[PDB]
Design a protein around this nucleic acid. Sequence first.
DNA 1: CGGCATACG
DNA 2: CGTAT
DNA 3: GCCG
Length: 326
Amino acid sequence: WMPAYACQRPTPLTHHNTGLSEALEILAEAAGFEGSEGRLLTFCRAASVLKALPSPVTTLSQLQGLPHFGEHSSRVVQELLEHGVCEEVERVRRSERYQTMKLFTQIFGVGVKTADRWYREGLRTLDDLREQPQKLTQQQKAGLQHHQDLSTPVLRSDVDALQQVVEEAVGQALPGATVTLTGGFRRGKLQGHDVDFLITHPKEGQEAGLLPRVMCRLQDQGLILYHQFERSFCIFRLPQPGSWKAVRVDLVVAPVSQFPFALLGWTGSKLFQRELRRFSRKEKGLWLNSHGLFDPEQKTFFQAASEEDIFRHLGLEYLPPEQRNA
DNA sequence: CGGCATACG
DNA sequence: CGTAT
DNA sequence: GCCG
Ligand SMILES: [Mg+2]
Ligand SMILES: [Mg+2]
Ligand code: NA
């Protein structure tokens, strides 16, 4: 009944097993901090399965036959059902390693590998990093300076304001160019930690060279607190009552021939796209990315005019963005 | 046991 | 190495 | 950690 790939089933934003999925996602996150991508994936997938169920899991037997539930994930659920708490999960939560790796990896410019090195050097706090700024990149310096604002959720009201200012700069950079909201907000989220925009133009090729022109205009408007092509990871100045706050904004440009693939990729979720690409390659023999869908036998790319086209060419039932919350 | 998504900056 | 979904 |  429950298919094995997350792209084969609807996953709504809110569901009936929130606490169970959150516990599994703690273990997934911890596995990632230790470099165990395989364990991270299994725990992520098991969490996602529960998000897709039509009602709460109340008994252990309801896990029988669910994909990605083996001894470990099942035991986690069993303990939560019987005692409201899983000792392993709580042990991770309070560990100095988990808390510090989470704190460090949250910094824009710091990945697992950097965080881990710092952890091994004895660093534990943000002020520990500030007191040795010679070791930080310019990106990390920006992430650390803006860390407090960047930890505050972006609201859907903020998004509309940012979109209008991005369209203004885009319209001057290239008349006729369009801006599409992607990422978590396109899946229906009411809050987020960043805002993702996809930019294109209806005349193939006109979008070449566009992103530098957009960025230089935004910067001239005084809206860019930080930025470093076709992808830009920025920190924007967002107006606030009597002041402002820093917000992470990603801008991506794609040619209109590739727009369906880029929209699909950048709308996520992250797990959904990984599962979709795994499904494409392993079940259909097709290679999927955010630029296209390649048949390695015929050596041809699939033309798509819509996301609907892509789901059809992979033999999957269409899922709107709000059901891609794997 | 191999595999685990696939890019760009 | 970082970033993104 | 789990699947095929
Ligand atoms: Mg986002
Ligand atoms: Mg983003
Ligand atoms: Na980071």
